[PDB]
Design a binder for this molecule. Structure first.
Ligand SMILES: CCCCCCCCCCCCCCCCCC(=O)OC[C@H](COP(=O)([O-])OCC(O)COP(=O)([O-])OC[C@@H](COC(=O)CCCCCCCCCCCCCCCCC)OC(=O)CCCCCCCCCCCCCCCCC)OC(=O)CCCCCCCCCCCCCCCCC
Ligand SMILES: CCCCCCCCCCCCCCCCCC(=O)OC[C@H](COP(=O)(O)OCCN)OC(=O)CCCCCCCCCCCCCCCCC
Ligand SMILES: CCCCCCCCCCCCCCCCCC(=O)OC[C@H](COP(=O)(O)OCCN)OC(=O)CCCCCCCCCCCCCCCCC
Ligand SMILES: CCCCCCCCCCCCCCCCCC(=O)OC[C@H](COP(=O)(O)OCCN)OC(=O)CCCCCCCCCCCCCCCCC
Ligand SMILES: CCCCCCCCCCCC(=O)OC[C@H](COP(=O)(O)OCC[N+](C)(C)C)OC(=O)CCCCCCCCCCC
Ligand SMILES: CCCCCCCCCCCC(=O)OC[C@H](COP(=O)(O)OCC[N+](C)(C)C)OC(=O)CCCCCCCCCCC
Ligand SMILES: CCCCCCCCCCCC(=O)OC[C@H](COP(=O)(O)OCC[N+](C)(C)C)OC(=O)CCCCCCCCCCC
Ligand SMILES: CCCCCCCCCCCCO[C@H]1O[C@H](CO)[C@@H](O[C@H]2O[C@@H](CO)[C@H](O)[C@H](O)[C@@H]2O)[C@H](O)[C@H]1O
Lengths: 86, 49, 44, 655, 486, 91, 198
């Protein structure tokens, strides 16, 4: 290629090295694309049940009941809201 | 740094007056919608009206 | 663009790591299914 | 079998890791194309999610496995793409896409393209993680890992010592901020009992203002590190040692925005910490003015553009200080586009010169040689100068106006500070344009014989980003700056909302002086440089000293290196040599050794004379009996008197 | 069948193996992995829903000195494991075979003695985690010093004589004050056992005296400022197995000793004294880190690095907060993974190739030694506390606890996050960065063995950093057993 | 599943030489503090839900839950058995 | 690997068969540090004694049964084989490979297999799977943490105090348990603090 220099051929990195472009890269790229598409499909399909929207999951009646129970607890324990001590 | 912050401080005395009052909000300053309980108005209540 | 010598894809580290990881994932899923059809995982 | 959020998270991780696993097997060709393609798909998915969110605005969540659940501290790997997040992701994915396609042509003939593309996607993945997390812990994960990736990308050319030192500067100056972030996390977990956004922003209106001020001061010092505000700005210009695509992605549009994202996510706490907003405002005002003053007296192109980025981040922080979070968000999104375009243009310019020089004093007249680069860089510079119709106008003029529209009386000065930084951006962009394109030649002749535009992989990104930097602001105006938009639903306090006053109170002078000032100062700088160039070349010692301070980054990298770093190394040597290898060895193996040498020698050189062994030891019996009898007399008389007698006897025996 | 028949089978097999092949390292590695597997089986058979001590056994009883006791009068040494013990026991059995394999090919003179001493130190440390009285703990806490003296003296570097004398004398100095403490405990209570020693409430004025001796021992063993100067020399001039064992397990014996000897007993003295602990810990953090910034020897730099993280662990364990205890334990485990990996890099990879440790010779390993550079970067960013490693989890929770206990000291201690980065990356940047050194010829990259060790130690820390919660089933009692709050 | 429900022992009713009852009491104290924590986490989860459903109405709708969470956080936490084992509050 | 593969005569010949050769350290160098200085008959000789290092010359039932005088012979003429093998492997950068049919072995280049280290079978098949087992055990013992037990217990206490929840629909009981938890105090810690009530 252009702008190239000698390099030690016995240096082995998990990345390429110096201008890595082996003469089988279409087959290996086919393998890598297959593994990548499969991994992406697996992760998406398996993470579908762990997704949710922010809103519309809990009825506001549940929210009303929980806030009312909170008030019940707060006056059972004899507590006043923030700022009322003045 | 001293030039910057000293000039910044000096320039505050040469500031024009505002032309409109701040905004004001209907229900006694939205103390309920901001989390008040009729004794917490001074803490959570916004401007008068 | 100049070429380099061929390099096989499934070198030993690929096989080892992918095999152990996918096998642990499969064992996890199998134990989950066991608890779905029983009341206790297989390892328990 | 379709998850926008999960595809968005996992595809960049694939693009990062599969090169690292399979690079020797795949090569740089396939790695480049694959990483590109995966980021392109993530970008399209983000655009579709943005469309759907404008339609509905019910954010998707992704609640995965549990990190730590010990005692009141429940941290999970939870993710979410809300309005703020999807905006940040538009920026991230778009600029990473364009940078990936740009670095195919830029970094050709580099032997280490595989690692470069792996690291670009590493940064993309961890920034997606930073923005999508639903708690501060995931944010910190992304924070620290983008710091790691910045170190490695600035250190990409490992044989260059200055690149290594610049990367060390970046990583340590950011771990300063990460230390303060860790302090903030500890305070949050103490006060709130949780690091999740939904509880903190539900309770924040009730907690003592002092604790929130502590939290937000710490997180703001973290953001002060990342966003290159003044006190911690020294790494951003040094990071230009890295390749230009890194400069376009990280240190223009993405990494420096993490601090802004932090402050914008924590807006719902900052509304109850007015002190910290004040500090943010004035630090940003200092930053925007001082970066411009440094840029106008700089001579390297990438440094000028980095300081431009610094100034725009300062203006974003001004907007945060004025409780104008949506404005800072909008300017972040626009700045990403037109600044990435600027850096890409600078890279093409740098590659048009045979010796890839970056000094504007050695470019000259490259207009007819580089016309496409010229129109792209001037599009970006006009969308940075805030000229009408472009994204800079809609994104930047509103902040200079909100300076005046703020209910606080003191913010009027910030109008003038921001105004001067604007009329300075006009200067330090027109300088670039003149010295690079319009001026007379300053290079040799072979440079202009071999000057040429670069390949499609460079130009197509520049085209797309120019389209963005022309239209996206007008598109997204009513989303971000409109009247009552509700898209980015940050709960601003009603007392602090100044937009309605900002658009109306503003009179003609304070609305037109920025634009008219730009359109005049640009013409004046061009005209002076072309006809009256002596104005900038007077050779006065008192002008040149001021130029030299402004050319040495406001002697900011000399104060840090000498009075902090070097004195720290000296104090560290003082510790290591005078305490850890001095006094603590004296109260230790050395002093005990000398003490025992002397004491042993005195003990054995007591029976002095070997001439007669009998008389000597006989005298010792006599002395022992006499001394004991008198000592027992003395202790019967009173005890404490015998103590110094025994001390002196030990002295005589052992000294 | 017989007990003696089975161990005589093992003994005869060992003798014949030594007769035919004149080396012991294969048999010791087989026993290494066998012990690991047996401990995993014990964890399989461990009830997490009982805070009690399990797998108890007593030795050297009056009625059966060469066997186990079933007596109604117990006068021997007690043994048994809690979840806290089992955590560090898992760490120990994980590390022992790696310490044997880290010196597989670089010991070419009196090999069998080296491997015997290494395995013996490891088994003493295991049994020390199994102990359930002050005296068995002590006799296994001090029994490593002869072996370490001999190992470091015979198989050590240039300055090995000084290091041998240090590792014995400093530790003996602290441990004899520990012995005075233990003697006082035994004569006052007439009992020494870690089961019911929180039932005996001593007077405050005597707790405050016993605590002094125990804490002097903990200060010399942890180490803590001002008694930290032996650790650079010892960890530097030792063989690789010694440094790994030391930094991974013997430094953690002090943490375990706090939690097992000093907090359950002596609660009121501890709750009165802990601001002094915080003074000492903050000093130990900041001054040791800054001292690291001006060191010229690599293994010495890593040695100094251990001290600051142990100081953060001390902040956590002396915090009276559950999160702090859990963080200190995770720090111990993750440091026991990461620091021996760094010691391997700087004492078995580079030292085996160049036989020198001065930083001025090393530069630009990335060119010929790229895998090593990747490992250095990973382990550096793990040692300084990057998230998704157990180091960050432990640091985070220890500093949480320190802030809860003393916000000012615990907040000032968070500059650890910075100073760690400085002293680690100033070294990493030079080693991995620049043009390759003119003082060094080219040598092989990391081998499959070295890579095996480093990969085990990286996988472990990444597992416990990505999901720290997997360690809670053996610690959800321990995080509440040593908390004094009314 | 065979979910266990052990018997509750107090330190005030036992003799500390019977170690079984002492361990039962330690485990009782710790177990009830963990149940307190699960109550706190239920409150926090409800607060999160009401915040995520209400939005700008959370200041009014989630008020009692927020105040309850901040009232419970200092007290519903792990605080160890030794402080009560080794101290008689009646003296 | 074999059971009973010891054969006295070849060892007792091999002793001085190797003593007639030069020392292992100085053989492949010649004191001039050159493989060429060694003669080529000597080189093939060294190759075929070195290939005898990785041959089964003993089994389990021969180490457990035979006497010391034979084991010592095996040991001290196996050390020599080992050292010849590895000194050649380093100096020459060749291993010896006897090919299939021709009965003559000589140093060759091919090093992409046919060589294994002595620590691999121990670790990769006793140590690695034990750590994988430890990971499995940790993951499935995490199911027994007190958080889950406490959740189940608290729900059960609520159901015992309010049995009316159970007849309600099956996907609504959770919210009702949450309501009653938020309302009440089902912990029993002040129950255990009897002497604190004055
Ligand atoms: C106290 C309590 C303590 C608690 C401790 C916790 C328990 C500890 C557990 C330890 C496990 C150890 C296992 C072992 O012994 O393996 C030995 C063995 C040792 O490695 P080795 O390859 O033989 O080393 C020699 C070289 O290969 C020989 O040299 P080489 O030529 O092959 O050089 C290659 C080398 C050289 O390259 C380098 O220099 C790079 C530096 C190496 C860094 C490696 C760190 C791991 C990176 C992971 C990246 C993921 C990021 C996200 O690079 C590598 O080997 C790395 C390969 C990268 C992966 C390949 C991609 C396939 C996909 O490793 C394996 O065989 C695979 C282990 C993988 C297990 C990982 C666990 C994954 C779990 C799945 C997740 C989802 C479900 C989880 C739930 C599970 C429920 C059951
Ligand atoms: C009823 C009350 C009784 C209580 C006890 C009171 C103690 C009275 C002690 C007085 C008895 C005489 C002993 C004095 C020490 C003998 C040697 C001496 O004179 O000290 C000097 C020695 C000098 O070192 P250098 O300066 O290099 O040599 C030139 C000296 N002309 O010094 C040195 O080598 C440097 C010293 C550095 C400091 C080291 C401190 C170490 C502390 C631990 C000491 C443990 C060893 C104790 C040895 C016992 C000796 C009796
Ligand atoms: C606690 C008591 C302290 C003991 C510390 C160990 C001191 C051992 C120092 C002497 C030694 O080397 O041990 C002897 C060893 C055999 O030594 P070796 O290397 O094999 O030399 C040829 C032997 N005929 O024999 C051994 O293997 C003994 C190992 C102990
Ligand atoms: C030495 C090598 C010992 C290896 C360990 C052997 C072992 O642990 O076997 C345990 C065996 C089975 O016990 P287990 O599976 O756990 O089931 C219990 C149900 N009854 O059960 C047994 O065999 C009985 C328990 C064995 C106890 C081993 C004690 C080893 C102590 C060595 C003493 C070292 C002396 C040095 C000085 C120590 C001073 C503290
Ligand atoms: C780092 C951050 C430091 C910022 C310093 C510049 C402050 C500034 O330029 O503004 C100055 C503010 C003004 O405060 P004021 O309330 O509006 O009073 C305005 C009325 N005077 C001017 C009469 C007081 O003075 C401060 O409050 C802190 C000084
Ligand atoms: C407060 C005011 C301080 C302004 C700093 C003055 C720098 C001195 C100088 O004269 O520097 C001039 C440089 C432009 O120099 P140049 O033509 O592009 O080439 C470099 C030639 N040098 C090296 C000789 C300079 O900066 C400017 O354009 C600033 C113009 C003033 C704009 C005011 C709005
Ligand atoms: C999160 C858990 C870990 C993730 C897995 C990481 C290991 C994968 C293997 C990487 C192989 C490699 O990077 O090679 C190492 C590269 C080789 O450079 P080269 O491109 O091949 O060209 C070769 C040209 N030399 C030889 C002249 C250099 O040396 C380096 O420049 C040092 C930088 C290390 C990069 C680290 C990768 C990012 C991981 C950081 C996570 C903290
Ligand atoms: C020096 C090398 C280091 C080795 C360190 C590792 C030591 C590991 C030992 C752990 C095994 C202990 O396991 C222990 O179990 C029980 C305790 O209930 C002991 O006690 C058992 O004694 C037998 C008596 O015939 C009966 O079963 C009795 O009911 C009891 O269960 C066992 O005698 C002992 O085996």
């Amino acid at each position: 290629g252009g702008g190239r220099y000698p390099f030690p051929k016995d240096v082995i990195s998990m990345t390429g090295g110096w201008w890595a472009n082996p003469s089988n890269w279409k087959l290996n790229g086919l393998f890598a694309t297959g593994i990548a598409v499969g991994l992406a499909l697996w992760v998406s399909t398996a993470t579908l049940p762990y997704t949710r929207r922010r809103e519309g999951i809990t009825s506001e009646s549940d929210i009303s009941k929980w806030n009312a129970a909170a008030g019940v607890w707060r006056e059972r324990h004899g507590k006043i809201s923030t700022g009322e001590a003045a | 740094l001293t030039i910057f912050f000293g000039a910044s401080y000096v320039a505050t005395y040469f500031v024009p007056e505002k032309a409109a009052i701040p905004r004001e909000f209907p229900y006694e300053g939205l103390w309920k919608e901001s989390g008040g309980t009729e004794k917490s108005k001074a803490f959570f209540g916004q401007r008068s009206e | 663009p100049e070429l380099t010598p061929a390099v096989p894809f499934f070198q030993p580290y690929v096989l080892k790591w992918a095999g152990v990881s996918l096998g642990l994932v499969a064992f996890y899923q199998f134990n989950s299914s066991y608890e779905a059809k029983n009341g206790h995982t297989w390892v328990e | 079998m379709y998850n926008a959020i999960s595809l968005i998270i996992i595809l960049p991780c694939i693009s990062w890791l599969f090169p690292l696993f399979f690079g020797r097997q795949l090569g740089y060709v396939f790695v480049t194309r694959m990483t590109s393609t995966l980021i392109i798909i993530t970008t399209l998915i983000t655009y579709y999610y943005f469309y759907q969110l404008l339609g509905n605005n019910n954010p998707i969540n992704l609640e995965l496995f549990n990190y730590l659940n010990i005692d009141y501290l429940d941290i999970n790997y939870n993710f979410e793409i809300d309005a703020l997040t999807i905006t940040m992701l538009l920026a991230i994915t778009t600029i990473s896409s364009m940078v990936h396609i740009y670095s195919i042509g830029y970094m050709e003939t580099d032997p280490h393209q595989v690692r470069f593309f792996s690291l670009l996607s590493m940064f993309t993945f961890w920034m997606i993680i930073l923005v999508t997390g639903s708690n501060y812990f995931v944010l910190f994960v992304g924070w620290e890992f983008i710091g790691v990736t910045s170190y490695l990308l600035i250190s990409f050319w490992v044989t260059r010592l200055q690149a290594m030192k610049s990367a060390l500067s970046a990583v340590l100056m950011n771990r300063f901020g990460d230390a303060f972030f860790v302090l903030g996390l500890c305070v949050i977990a103490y006060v709130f009992g949780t690091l999740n956004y939904s509880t903190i922003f539900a309770t924040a209106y009730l907690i003592n203002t002092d604790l929130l001020v502590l939290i937000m001061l710490a997180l703001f010092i973290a953001a002060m590190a990342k966003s290159a505000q003044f006190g911690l700005h020294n790494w951003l210009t040094l990071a230009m040692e890295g390749p230009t695509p890194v400069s376009s992605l990280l240190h223009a549009a993405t990494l420096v925005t993490a601090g802004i994202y932090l402050l914008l996510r924590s807006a719902n706490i900052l509304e109850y910490t007015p002190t910290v907003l004040f500090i943010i405002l004035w630090i940003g005002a200092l930053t925007t003015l001082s970066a411009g003053l440094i840029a106008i007296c700089s001579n390297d192109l990438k440094r000028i553009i980095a300081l431009s980025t610094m100034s725009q981040l300062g203006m974003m922080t001004i907007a945060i200080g004025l409780s104008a979070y949506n404005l800072a968000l909008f300017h972040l999104l626009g700045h990403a586009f037109f600044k990435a375009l600027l850096f890409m243009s600078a890279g093409s310019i740098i590659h048009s010169i045979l010796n890839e020089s970056q000094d504007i004093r050695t470019y000259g007249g490259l207009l007819s040689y580089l016309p496409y680069t010229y129109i792209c860089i001037t599009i970006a510079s006009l969308s940075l100068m805030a000229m009408p119709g472009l994204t800079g106008y809609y994104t930047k003029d509103i902040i200079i106006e909100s300076t005046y529209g703020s209910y606080s009386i003191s913010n009027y000065v910030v109008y003038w500070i921001a105004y001067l930084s604007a009329v300075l951006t006009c200067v330090y962009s027109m300088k670039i344009l003149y010295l690079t394109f319009y001026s007379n030649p300053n290079n040799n002749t072979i440079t202009y014989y071999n000057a040429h535009e670069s390949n499609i992989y460079i130009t197509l990104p520049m085209f797309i980003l120019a389209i963005f930097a022309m239209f996206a602001g007008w598109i997204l105006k009513d989303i971000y700056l409109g009247v009552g938009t509700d898209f980015v639903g940050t709960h601003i306090l009603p007392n602090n909302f100044s937009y309605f006053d900002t658009e109306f109170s503003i009179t003609q002078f304070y609305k037109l002086l920025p634009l008219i000032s730009a359109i005049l100062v640009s013409i004046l700088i061009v005209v002076l440089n072309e006809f009256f160039a002596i104005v900038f070349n007077l050779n006065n010692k008192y002008i040149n000293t001021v130029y030299s301070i402004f050319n040495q980054k406001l002697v900011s990298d000399q104060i840090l290196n000498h009075f902090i770093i070097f004195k720290g190394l000296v104090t560290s040597g003082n510790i290591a040599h005078h305490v850890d290898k001095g006094s603590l060895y004296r109260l230790g193996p050395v002093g005990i050794n000398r003490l025992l040498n002397k004491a042993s020698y005195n003990v054995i050189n007591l029976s002095s004379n070997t001439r007669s062994s009998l008389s000597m030891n006989s005298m010792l019996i006599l002395i022992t009996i006499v001394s004991l009898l008198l000592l027992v007399l003395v202790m019967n008389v009173n005890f404490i008197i015998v103590i110094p007698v025994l001390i002196s006897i030990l002295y005589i025996l052992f000294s | 069948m017989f007990l003696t028949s089975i161990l005589l089978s093992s003994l005869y097999l060992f003798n014949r193996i030594l007769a035919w092949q004149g080396n012991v390292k294969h048999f010791y590695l087989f026993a290494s992995n066998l012990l690991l597997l047996f401990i995993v089986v014990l964890y399989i058979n461990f009830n997490t829903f009982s805070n009690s001590f399990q797998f108890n056994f007593e030795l050297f009883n009056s009625l059966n000195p060469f066997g186990l006791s079933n007596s109604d009068i117990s006068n021997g040494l007690l043994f048994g494991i809690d979840g806290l013990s089992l955590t560090f026991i898992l760490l120990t059995v994980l590390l022992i075979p790696l310490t044997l394999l880290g010196n597989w090919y670089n010991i070419n003179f009196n090999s069998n003695l080296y491997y015997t001493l290494v395995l013996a130190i490891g088994l003493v440390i295991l049994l020390n985690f199994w102990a359930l009285d002050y005296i068995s703990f002590y006799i296994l806490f001090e029994a490593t010093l002869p072996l370490l003296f001999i190992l470091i003296h015979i198989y050590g570097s240039s300055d090995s004589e000084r290091a041998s004398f240090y590792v014995l004398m400093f530790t003996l100095s602290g441990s004899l004050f520990m012995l005075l403490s233990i003697v006082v405990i035994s004569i006052v209570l007439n009992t020494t056992n870690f089961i019911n020693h929180n039932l005996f409430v001593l007077s405050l004025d005597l707790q405050t005296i016993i605590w002094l001796g125990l804490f002097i021992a903990i200060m010399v063993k942890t180490p803590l400022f001002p008694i930290h100067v032996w650790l650079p020399v010892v960890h530097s001039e030792s063989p690789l197995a010694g440094s790994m064992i030391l930094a991974g397990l013997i430094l953690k014996l002090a943490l375990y000793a706090i939690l097992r000897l000093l907090l359950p007993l002596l609660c009121e003295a501890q709750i009165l004294y802990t601001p002094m602990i915080y003074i000492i810990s903050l000093l130990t953090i900041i001054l040791t880190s800054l001292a690291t910034l001006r060191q010229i020897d690599l293994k010495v730099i890593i040695a100094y690095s251990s001290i600051s993280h142990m100081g953060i662990a001390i902040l956590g364990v002396c915090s009276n907060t559950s999160l702090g205890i859990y963080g200190s334990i995770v720090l111990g485990v993750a440091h026991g993974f990461v620091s021996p990996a760094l010691f391997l890099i700087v004492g078995g990879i580079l030292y085996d190739r160049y036989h020198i440790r001065i930083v001025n010779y090393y530069k630009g390993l990335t060119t010929y030694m790229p895998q090593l550079a990747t490992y250095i970067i990973i382990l550096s960013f793990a040692n300084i506390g990057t998230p998704l490693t157990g180091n960050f989890t432990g640091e985070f929770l220890s500093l949480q606890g320190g802030f809860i206990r003393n916000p000012i000291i615990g907040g000032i201690s968070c500059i650890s996050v910075l100073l760690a980065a400085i002293y680690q990356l100033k070294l990493t940047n030079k080693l991995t960065g620049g043009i390759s050194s003119i003082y060094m010829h080219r040598t092989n990259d990391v081998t499959i063995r070295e890579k095996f060790i480093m990969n085990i130690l990286i996988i472990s820390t990444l597992i416990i950093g990505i999901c720290p919660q997997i360690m809670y089933n053996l610690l959800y009692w321990t995080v509440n057993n040593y908390i004094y709050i009314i | 599943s065979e979910h266990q429900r052990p018997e509750l022992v107090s330190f005030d009713d036992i003799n500390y030489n019977d170690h079984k009852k002492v361990r039962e009491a330690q485990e009782s104290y710790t177990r009830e503090q963990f149940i307190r924590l699960e109550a706190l986490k239920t409150v926090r989860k409800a607060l999160e839900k009401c915040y995520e459903e209400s939005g700008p109405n959370h200041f009014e709708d989630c008020k009692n839950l927020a105040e309850q969470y901040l009232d419970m956080l200092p007290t519903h936490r792990l605080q160890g058995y030794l402080g009560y084992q080794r101290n008689d509050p009646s003296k | 690997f074999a059971l009973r593969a010891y054969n006295e005569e070849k060892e007792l010949a091999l002793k001085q068969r190797l003593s007639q050769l030069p020392p292992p350290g100085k053989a492949f160098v010649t004191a001039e540090g050159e493989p060429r200085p060694a003669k080529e008959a000597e080189l093939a000789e060294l190759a075929e004694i070195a290939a005898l290092y990785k041959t089964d010359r003993v089994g389990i039932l021969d180490i457990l049964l035979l006497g010391n005088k034979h084991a010592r012979l095996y040991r001290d003429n196996t050390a020599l084989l080992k050292d010849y093998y590895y000194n050649g492997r380093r100096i020459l950068d060749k291993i010896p490979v006897k090919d299939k049919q021709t009965g003559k072995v000589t140093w060759e280049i091919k090093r992409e297999g046919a060589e294994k280290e002595d620590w691999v079978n121990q670790m990769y098949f006793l140590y690695a799977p034990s750590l994988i087992l430890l990971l499995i055990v940790m993951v499935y013992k995490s199911r027994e943490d007190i958080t889950f037990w406490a959740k189940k217990e608290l729900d059960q206490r609520v159901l015992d105090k309010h049995p009316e929840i159970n007849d309600a629909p099956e996907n609504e009981r959770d919210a009702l348990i949450v309501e009653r938890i938020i309302a009440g105090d089902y912990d029993k810690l002040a129950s255990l603090q009897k002497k604190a009530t004055p």
